[model samples]
Target: MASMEMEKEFEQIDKSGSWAAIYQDIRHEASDFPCRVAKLPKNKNRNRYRDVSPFDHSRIKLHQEDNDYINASLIKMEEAQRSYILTQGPLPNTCGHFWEMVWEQKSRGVVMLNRVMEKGSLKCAQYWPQKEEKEMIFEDTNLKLTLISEDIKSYYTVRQLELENLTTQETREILHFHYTTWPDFGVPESPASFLNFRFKVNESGSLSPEHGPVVVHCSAGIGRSGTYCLADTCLLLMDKRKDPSSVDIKKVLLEMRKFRMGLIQTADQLRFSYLAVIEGAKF
Candidate 1:
């Protein structure tokens, strides 16, 4: 429908004036940032993601109403010089498409708030960093990837921000010094874990435009990343005194659609963001 026609539809509703005001807000929100979910490129690597993904099979069977799969043929590519990398759920195929997408974006000299974990856990501890005494080896030594598992006492002492200085060099340099810690759960738990994590990202200068777009992920990268970004924005909107019901989490998802389409579409994940803000408001 045309803009005027759509306006006419809501003209009879009470407090339609708020929609007029909110219209500009929505435009500003959509225009100021770059976001889109690229269709899964039909490369051999990305095609591999179909089976292992927790969302690919059962999600459709369980929730048939949502059009949740990617359209590899009609990909929407973004020309962002830098973009943040975040994940909402598990890495079905080691996030091949997401990685390829990031590579294309990064090749344009864009910065990424990367949170891809290195291949190794702290020798023994899954929640903590590898024991300093024993060397922990990473799988993909090709990229300067870092890990931010549940361990706070060890790795939290040092924060390493990875950048693509060279294509082949896997060894990363510590760009700056910033350390933070919070309670860690197995995930799909409380949004507070992600909330505290986002605070660390902004405080460490990772989220700023100067640093380019931030790249975030978990073991897989979809579910956790989506919840983190959505909950963070929701909390921000709440802070501005916006009605939580009026704020569509889809707006947040729409903005970051490129990272992963419908990354956090599950009811549980949606409710997690809602509960995070509501429970947080009590305090």
Candidate 2:
């Protein structure tokens, strides 16, 4: 029943050409909210031309002792009882801070949607351990990161990392899900592949309420990052509500943008988000 309803709603969206108006409405509504433009200067190092800002209310606060703040936000969905730490790609200098935040938050997973390089540009710093470099140690943070295992696929890669707190001599396992095929400024080729990747992340059980929030990032942590969160949230809502038609993609996007600015960057992304949710409802 839910799958049929999702099919109907998705078809209506495509046939009626309502996605543009919905996107325009989201943009218009988001303009009135304060995105804390004043806070951008506080971020010491950002990798992109886009502004680095978070809503004042939901912005993640780093320890005063930690220097060089990175662009990140704590987004909590109370309705679904889920939370995610949305952050930008780490800068070369901010790699320490990136891991610091994950350790501090006790995050179980890092969902990275962009690659180190895209379209002849460096989209993100190499923040994790590569195959050759099996381990990474951040002396400043007293942390040692080691890559335990890696499963590389055609479009995505799953990695198992071990993070140890050198001072405490305690260690924890962290899962890294990397989606490689997504373009920097474009949507995925199809929702089928994206959903498969989403399910892979879900299988890790990192997003469960028992654990800390999952850290999600792309180049800016707003475009593809936002789409991923929005789609996941909608699917969760469908399951909880027992009505696939009840989840409003635009409304959820608007609410999520209140926590972090500029989610679902383009209409294409918004449309693709709907496609992903609709496709996911089937399973």
Candidate 3:
């Protein structure tokens, strides 16, 4: 398809004003799954937003039996051969659980999609350690983290870190990708940079099926995080089928909702998801 041809499909959807309708349909068809664990008294503050919490069936469980709750969900798109642990930005107290989840899950990558402070509000806690800060300990679970390097791109930043479990003397390298330009309740400036940032992670093989699920998070973990996973999975699906036209983005998003509730928080984000997938299919 020519540029005109590609733009035409998106323009048609825009002209018809169907994005909102499509978004509404997605919100409507979602059946309630048990978020009983998310609703428990002790786990309430762990959630960034009152309404956004992981469903029990797919939420990740931390080690301690007494304190096993973390506001994270594992989204699996088997058809596309991709999986992501989507979670909200760590709260003030839940930062320990965040690292514990990363270590326990054996995840090699952490994708942070929101800035710590957005629009004068603390979007995410300074969960990762500061540059001068060396060791982190929580409830006698001793761990050490060392920042290997930091690369600052125009719209995003990449940090290389090494995580060590002090007791076992086991260590793992962590690839952290942070998108600093994404706005709250808004899409990226363009799919080009966003896809550029995303595929860089893919290139590192952090998302490989052999490795543990990559942890992805945003302010609320549903909108921006969901958009990233949706676009990534849909791109793989298109490549697997060798036809972008046959890929049903809506259906794929609906299937993802089965694992986490209220994904793609805004109509714009849903619209951007389409744009991102379409753009990635090009190259």
Best by lDDT: 3
Query: What's the lDDT for residue 267 in model 2?
Result: 90
Per-model lDDT: 0.38, 0.82, 0.85
Residue-level lDDT of model 3, residues 194-225, one tens digit each, is 99998899998776777899999998889899
Model 3 scores a TM of: 0.94
Q: How far is candidate 1 from the true structure (C-alpha RMSD, Å)?
A: 12.7
Candidate 1 vs 2: which has more lDDT:
2
Candidate 2 segments whose C-alpha is farther than 4 A from its true place: 31-42, 132-134
The list of candidate 3 runs beyond 4 A from truth reads 1-7
Across residues 1-283, which tens digit of lDDT does each residue of candidate 1 receive?
Answer: 2223322433442244343344344334432222222224432333323432322212111112323332121111132122444432223443333333333333211111223233333111132123333333233312323333222333233334343324465433322212223223333465564445445555654445543344444433444445665666655554554444454554655655533444553445555655565554443
Any runs in candidate 1 off by more than 4 Å, and if so which?
Answer: 1-42, 46-48, 51-83, 87-151, 154-158, 161-189, 238-246, 254-259, 279-283
Which pairs of residues have clashing backbones in candidate 2?
A: none
* The best candidate in terms of TM-score: 3
Per-residue lDDT for 99 in model 1?
34
Separately for all candidates shown, the number of backbone clashes (residues 3 or more apart, or on different chains) is 31, 0, 0
Weakest 10 consecutive residues of candidate 2 by summed lDDT = 31-40
